[PDB]
Structure formats: C-alpha cells, structure tokens
Design a protein around this nucleic acid. Structure first.
Ligand SMILES: [Mg+2]
Ligand SMILES: [Mg+2]
Ligand SMILES: [Mg+2]
Ligand SMILES: [Mg+2]
Ligand SMILES: [Mg+2]
Ligand SMILES: [Mg+2]
Ligand SMILES: [Mg+2]
Ligand SMILES: [Mg+2]
Ligand SMILES: [Mg+2]
Ligand SMILES: [Mg+2]
Ligand SMILES: [Mg+2]
Ligand SMILES: [Mg+2]
Ligand SMILES: [Mg+2]
Ligand SMILES: [Mg+2]
Ligand SMILES: [Mg+2]
Ligand SMILES: [Mg+2]
Ligand SMILES: [Mg+2]
Ligand SMILES: [Mg+2]
Ligand SMILES: [Mg+2]
Ligand SMILES: [Mg+2]
Ligand SMILES: [Mg+2]
Ligand SMILES: [Mg+2]
Ligand SMILES: [Mg+2]
Ligand SMILES: [Mg+2]
Ligand SMILES: [Mg+2]
Ligand SMILES: [Mg+2]
Ligand SMILES: [Mg+2]
Ligand SMILES: [Mg+2]
Ligand SMILES: [Mg+2]
Ligand SMILES: [Mg+2]
Ligand SMILES: [Mg+2]
Ligand SMILES: [Mg+2]
Ligand SMILES: [Mg+2]
Ligand SMILES: [Mg+2]
Ligand SMILES: [Mg+2]
Ligand SMILES: [Mg+2]
Ligand SMILES: [Mg+2]
Ligand SMILES: [Mg+2]
Ligand SMILES: [Mg+2]
Ligand SMILES: [Mg+2]
Ligand SMILES: [Mg+2]
Ligand SMILES: [Mg+2]
Ligand SMILES: [Mg+2]
Ligand SMILES: [Mg+2]
Lengths: 70, 116, 101, 87
RNA sequence: GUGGGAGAGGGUGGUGGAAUUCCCGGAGUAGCGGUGAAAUGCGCAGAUACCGGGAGGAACGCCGAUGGCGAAGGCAGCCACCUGGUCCACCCGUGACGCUGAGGCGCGAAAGCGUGGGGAGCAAACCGGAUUAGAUACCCGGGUAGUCCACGCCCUAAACGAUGCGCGCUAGGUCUCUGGGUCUCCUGGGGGCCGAAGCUAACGCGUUAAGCGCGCCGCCUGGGGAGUACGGCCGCAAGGC
C-alpha cells in the first residue's frame, strides 16, 4: 500500500483545525493509524496523536465509527 | 399489521446464544427470534445452526408485516455470528448493508475475573 | 502575558439578535479579563463529526489573543456559563510545526 | 515562573563587577530566588513531594556554596547573608 | 551564565467521548443468562434483544512502542495555571567550591487502620447453585469490607537489574529515542541486541561491566530452631525496625 505522508503536501502537524488533512490519518473507524501506515517519525506521530485528540474534542474528527463490511 | 417493508436487523451474537431483532427504520422493533425461541435449550443455542434458524424465524416473522429491505447490524463475536448473516441473506429479505457495531469500551469498567 | 488561541463553538440555530448578543457577550467577557485580540477567524456552520447537544452541526469561532496567564481558567469558566456556548477550548499558541517539508 | 527580566535584575545586583555571571554571591543569589519561588509554591500544594525533592537539592547546593565562602573570605559571607537575610 | 530542546516527572482546577449499571419513555414476545454439561438466579408487575431521554461513579480504546519521564515507589483522554528534574550548543563567569555518607529528616505499590464522604463496575468474608469419594476450592449466580475522594496513620514487598554510589580506564558492529553539526555520516545524552580483551564454578557479563583500578557506606560467615523468645523504640490496631 501507499503511506499517508508519502501522498500529501507540506502541512501543519500542529493544526488541530484542518480536518481535510487530519481525516486522512484516521481509519474506516475513527482509530488513529499506526506509524507503519502513516509513514511518520517518532516525534511526528506523538504530535499528531495530540493534535487529532484536540480536533476530536472540537467535534471535528470522530472518536469511533461503524465498519461497513463483514 | 404495520406494513413497514424496510428497516433494520440486529444480530446479537454471544458465545452462549445468537439472537436476532428486526425493527423499523426509526429503530423500534417489529419481531424477533433467538436460540431459545426455536426449540433449542442449553448450549445448543450458541451454535451456528440455532443462529441460522433464529435468523430465519425472525425473517419470516417480518414477512408478515411485509418486510422486503433489511439493513443488517451485528454486535458481538460468537459462533454463528456469520452463519446468522449468511442465513439472513438467503431469507429472501434483500440485505441492504452490513455493519459491525460491537461496543468496545475505552477501558472504563473493571471486567469480571472470567475476562481477566 | 502569553499568547493563546480561543475556540468557541455555539448552537447553530441563532438568528441575528441572539448571534450578536452571544458574541458581544464574548467581547465583554474578554475585556474584563484583559485579552488583547490579535486576529479572528469566523468559520461558522461546520458539519460535526458526532452529535453535540443533539445538534449535528456547530458554529465555529477562533480568537488569537495575548493576556495575563493567571486569569485564563477563570476566562474559560466565564465563557461556558452561556447556555448557547457549548465548547470552549483554549490552547497556548505554538509554532506551526511542519512535516514533509 | 522566573523570567529572564527578573533573572538579570538579580545577576546585576550581586555581580562583583560588570560581566560576572558565576560568582559565589551570584550563584547563592540565584539559588535563593528559586528557593523562595518554590517554598511559596509549597505553602499550598503541600502534597507535591517530587518538587519538594528539587528544593532539598537547592538548599544543599546553596548551603554548600555558603559553607565555602565562610572558609575563604568571611567578610563577603556576612555582607551576602545580611543582604539575603539568612541563617 | 547565555541560548535552545524532548518527556504518561509532580501538584491544582476544569473538561471530552466510548462502555457498564440504574431510572423514564417508546416499541416488542417467551425466554434470557450461564456451563464440560448444568442448576441456583432473573423474566407476565413484560426481562433479554432495539431506539431515544436522563442520573451516577470509575477507568482512559486507537496513538502505544522492544518507546518516553522519575531517586525509588511509580507516571497514560484533553485543556490551562503552579512546578521539579534533565540534555545539547557557545567556551562567557566563579576557581577544588569535590565524592561517599554511620545518625537525622523527607519519600515510600498493594493491602490494612481512624474520622467524614462516595459507591457504577469488580469483589476477601459470607449466601447460594454445581463438581466431587468429600469441595471448607478452582467453574456458575448473588454480595459486605474494600477498591475511588479528603485529612491523618501504617513503612512492608520477587520495594528486582535478585547487580549500593561516584570517577578514571579497556576493540567494534547493529537497532533506537533525543539534541547539535560542515546532515552517505560525524558528534553528544539515554534505551536494546551481538560480541575484542578480560572476568566467571557454570549460565553468563562485556564503554549501560559482572573487566582493570581508587574512595566511601551497607551487608555476609552451615541448615532447622527463627525473623521466633526477651528487652527496647515505634504504632490506635494489625504489626513494623
Ligand atoms: Mg447457551
Ligand atoms: Mg464482554
Ligand atoms: Mg478482550
Ligand atoms: Mg477474547
Ligand atoms: Mg487482563
Ligand atoms: Mg454551556
Ligand atoms: Mg528549558
Ligand atoms: Mg505530566
Ligand atoms: Mg422499559
Ligand atoms: Mg421464577
Ligand atoms: Mg447513584
Ligand atoms: Mg498498548
Ligand atoms: Mg530513565
Ligand atoms: Mg517496576
Ligand atoms: Mg520545564
Ligand atoms: Mg574560561
Ligand atoms: Mg581568573
Ligand atoms: Mg540515610
Ligand atoms: Mg505506604
Ligand atoms: Mg492503599
Ligand atoms: Mg478507609
Ligand atoms: Mg459480580
Ligand atoms: Mg463470585
Ligand atoms: Mg475426585
Ligand atoms: Mg541470595
Ligand atoms: Mg532485598
Ligand atoms: Mg551501542
Ligand atoms: Mg539532524
Ligand atoms: Mg549509547
Ligand atoms: Mg574470550
Ligand atoms: Mg552480552
Ligand atoms: Mg572511553
Ligand atoms: Mg564502571
Ligand atoms: Mg541483617
Ligand atoms: Mg530444610
Ligand atoms: Mg545454626
Ligand atoms: Mg523439612
Ligand atoms: Mg530462617
Ligand atoms: Mg516478619
Ligand atoms: Mg535479651
Ligand atoms: Mg516486642
Ligand atoms: Mg503502645
Ligand atoms: Mg491476625
Ligand atoms: Mg508480618
């Protein structure tokens, strides 16, 4: 598969408000993807985790979703 | 007596039983079956067969109120969780979609020693 | 004084009489707590990710301010008072950490 | 906290000459300012035992520099102590 | 000193969603639950399963790691205030100010104790159902203290790296967190794995030493009796040194 950072632009990892780009780090469910799927660095993923959780509290990113399969 | 003809089907599948509820689009139920509703009594209810016959018992009960379209919702891991789905597709009820909505806590409540 | 970012989400059903009142109330609360406003971004109606207060949307405000630090939590306490105010999240401003640069 | 505005105000007050940042008097000044920051933070927050450890380390280092000044030049020790109100 | 940096380090207030339980309403029949099978249990006063509204308490899924932080105990949603430790670059300042450390004082998981709260889930004791030759148990249904909070005690542990602290020295390779740099890499500070020399009874250790040396503290001298007896100090008690 492709990795998220690979197919993307130059973005602000600290901006909790940019949903169009943060939605690209969630799964089909609301889960935050592992580094093996985001292609981020140790320091970056730690920062992404916090910024997505920030967006979740503003109602911009979901906490959990429903899987349409199985 | 209702003529709903479109709605939801919830499969609650545990290791001790598989039980199927059928509701209208708003969520309010119509009919339902389970492993105990059909003749099975003990551990047999949590079998894929009982899962099948339960799914089909409610699927024919819903034909009475005129159901055709069905949206499937699944909660729990269980024997015959899949077998009740596979039964539901062949029930004549045209299956609109399938969703797995099994509730997972964010580690909030202390489980019983059985799950520890 | 440190520099913060104020996020305020309120009920997206207000007419103008109530929208002005609610925001000129947010002005009045900021004045009393000593917040010089550096810039404002008003996004407005935005589809929310989950229902908040049974409402599928929310009206979005964002302020960048500079204020004395000791007074911040009493400013949060003062904004959540309003029934129409639903989310108050105040973050200390940070540098825009780039990635894939 | 302790801004560099207040830092310099102290380092210039206790420097033995312009440009001195490391004199014993200047160190004991700078430690003592952090001591009084922390012990007022510990009047409230009595249950903060990890910050309390940092303080026990500062007093140890502040009393180690004073125990040194006493040995070499006892005059600057009194003029330091009487200026910081200690012991 | 100056200028940068990472982090579940600590304390306080606030706050967000998922889940369990209970209550209200809607809808809806004959069982649910649970096990190796079962039974007690719950269900027609309508449960389980489903939708919505509400209350309350506790713990934070993914991120999450062989990862990070702390002296140890230990620390995991998010936000803000107070705050501790530590690391790097500059080579600026003081000029041996150092190391260890019997006492002392402070910290110290869990459990337990006191006063007052709180009480959703779990659950010693206990009440039942099973299994069994018996069941004072594992398995099942219930359930009190407690687990949570405040204030004050208790001071134990496989409190573990079964490895006291500080410093100098002695091949490398490789993975990694985090700084700086002339940024295939070099250079620091942590966390892993192989392995030179060497040590070890062996397993194994090996620049994070269990190697070569130095300083200082703690401790050992066959097993049972016994962490018992007596005495002393401490504790409300259980009990601890
Ligand atoms: Mg069963
Ligand atoms: Mg479960
Ligand atoms: Mg599990
Ligand atoms: Mg499992
Ligand atoms: Mg477990
Ligand atoms: Mg409000
Ligand atoms: Mg700093
Ligand atoms: Mg912290
Ligand atoms: Mg009801
Ligand atoms: Mg009965
Ligand atoms: Mg209650
Ligand atoms: Mg994990
Ligand atoms: Mg460490
Ligand atoms: Mg440990
Ligand atoms: Mg700091
Ligand atoms: Mg020099
Ligand atoms: Mg000189
Ligand atoms: Mg001691
Ligand atoms: Mg203790
Ligand atoms: Mg305890
Ligand atoms: Mg108690
Ligand atoms: Mg229980
Ligand atoms: Mg039990
Ligand atoms: Mg036997
Ligand atoms: Mg031994
Ligand atoms: Mg020991
Ligand atoms: Mg190495
Ligand atoms: Mg670099
Ligand atoms: Mg290293
Ligand atoms: Mg050899
Ligand atoms: Mg080795
Ligand atoms: Mg060397
Ligand atoms: Mg060594
Ligand atoms: Mg001894
Ligand atoms: Mg023996
Ligand atoms: Mg003997
Ligand atoms: Mg014997
Ligand atoms: Mg013995
Ligand atoms: Mg003993
Ligand atoms: Mg004697
Ligand atoms: Mg005695
Ligand atoms: Mg006594
Ligand atoms: Mg006893
Ligand atoms: Mg004992």
């Amino acid at each position: 598969k492709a990795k998220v950072k690979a197919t993307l632009g130059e973005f602000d990892l600290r901006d909790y408000r940019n949903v169009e780009v943060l939605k690209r780090f969630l799964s089909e469910t609301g889960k935050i993807l592992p580094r093996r799927r985001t292609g981020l660095s140790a320091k970056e993923q730690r920062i992404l985790a916090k910024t997505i959780k920030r967006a979740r509290i503003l109602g911009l990113l979901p906490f959990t979703e429903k899987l349409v399969r199985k | 007596k209702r003529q709903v003809a479109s709605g939801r089907a919830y499969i609650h599948a545990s290791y001790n039983n598989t039980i199927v509820t059928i509701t209208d689009p708003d969520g309010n139920p119509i009919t339902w079956s389970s492993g105990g509703v059909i003749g099975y009594k003990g551990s047999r209810k949590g079998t894929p067969y009982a899962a099948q016959l339960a799914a089909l018992d409610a699927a024919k009960k819903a034909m009475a109120y005129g159901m055709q379209s069905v949206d499937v919702i699944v909660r729990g891991t269980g024997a015959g969780r899949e077998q009740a789905i596979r039964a539901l597709q062949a029930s004549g009820l045209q299956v609109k979609s399938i969703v797995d909505d099994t509730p997972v806590p964010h580690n909030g409540c202390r489980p019983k020693k059985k799950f520890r | 004084m440190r520099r913060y970012e104020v996020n305020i989400v309120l009920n997206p059903n207000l007419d103008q009489s109530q929208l002005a009142l609610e925001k000129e109330i947010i002005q009045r609360a900021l004045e009393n707590y000593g917040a010089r406003v550096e810039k404002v971004e008003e996004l407005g109606l935005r589809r929310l990710a989950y229902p908040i207060a049974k409402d599928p949307q929310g009206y979005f405000l964002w302020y960048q301010v500079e204020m004395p630090e000791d007074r911040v939590n009493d400013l949060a306490r003062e904004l959540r008072i309003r029934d129409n105010v639903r989310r108050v999240m105040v973050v200390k401003s940070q540098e825009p950490f780039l990635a894939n640069a | 906290p302790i801004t560099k505005e207040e830092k310099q105000k102290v380092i210039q007050e206790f420097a033995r000459f312009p440009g001195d940042t490391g004199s014993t008097e200047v160190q004991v000044a700078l430690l003592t300012l952090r001591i009084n920051r922390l012990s007022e933070h510990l009047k409230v927050h009595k249950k903060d035992h990890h910050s309390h450890r940092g303080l026990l380390m500062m007093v140890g280092q502040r009393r180690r520099l004073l125990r040194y000044l006493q040995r070499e030049d006892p005059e600057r020790y009194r003029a330091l102590i009487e200026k910081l109100g200690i012991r």
